[PDB]
Amino acid sequence: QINQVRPKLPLLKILHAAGAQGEMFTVKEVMHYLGQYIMVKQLYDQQEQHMVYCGGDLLGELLGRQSFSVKDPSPLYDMLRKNLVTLAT
Ligand SMILES: COc1ccc(C2=N[C@@H](c3cc(Br)ccc3F)[C@@H](c3ccc(Cl)cc3)N2C(=O)N2CCNC(=O)C2)c(OC(C)C)c1
């Protein structure tokens, strides 16, 4: 069931838009919803599926990189540690 977390408002809005409600979802849920959002808004390449291509989406603007890798999520963790209250997995 639901456990302790606190996000940032422009990141919580990605979480509502990915299918959620409230602001209370742990890093496991946040990353699941980020995967749904990237697939739902189509922020990736069909051959470079390990690579995200948000190009100017509110998610890419908020994270501060408009492209990043699933095997090198460095700007994604950097945004999360500055948005969320430091949830890690
Ligand atoms: C070889 O390339 C891969 C491999 C794996 C994925 C992958 N792995 C997850 C994941 C990764 C991490 Br770091 C931490 C927690 C996770 F939960 C998650 C995801 C969620 C949010 C983000 Cl920001 C990025 C990726 N993620 C998916 O959303 N998937 C994998 C299964 N099938 C799908 O269609 C969608 C993949 O994803 C890209 C398409 C986005 C591509």
CB 8 within 8 A of CB 83: yes
CATH number at residue 71: 1.10.245.10
Residues in Cβ contact with 3 at an 8 Å cutoff, skipping those fewer than 6 apart = 26
Instruction: Let me know if 18 is exposed, middle or buried by CB neighbors in 10 A (0-12, 13-18, 19+).
Output: buried
Method used to determine the 3D structure:
NMR
Residue nearest to atom 36 of ligand 1 (CA): 50
Chain breaks in the chain (C to N over 2.5 A) after: none
Q: Which helix (H) or strand (E) covers residue 51, if one does?
A: strand 51-53
Q: What is the DSSP string of 64-85?
A: T-SEEESS--HHHHHHHHHHSS
Full residue range of the structural domain in which residue 37 is found: 1-89
Question: Any residues with Cβ below 6 Å from ligand 1, and which?
Answer: 31-32, 34-35, 38-39, 44, 49-50, 52, 70, 73, 76
Residue nearest to atom 22 of ligand 1 (CA): 35
Q: Given the CA of residue 68, which atom of ligand 1 is nearest to it?
A: 23
Instruction: Look at the chain and report how many structural domains it folds into.
Output: 1
Taking the centre of ligand 1 as the mean of its atom positions, its distance from the CA of residue 35, in whole angstroms, is 6
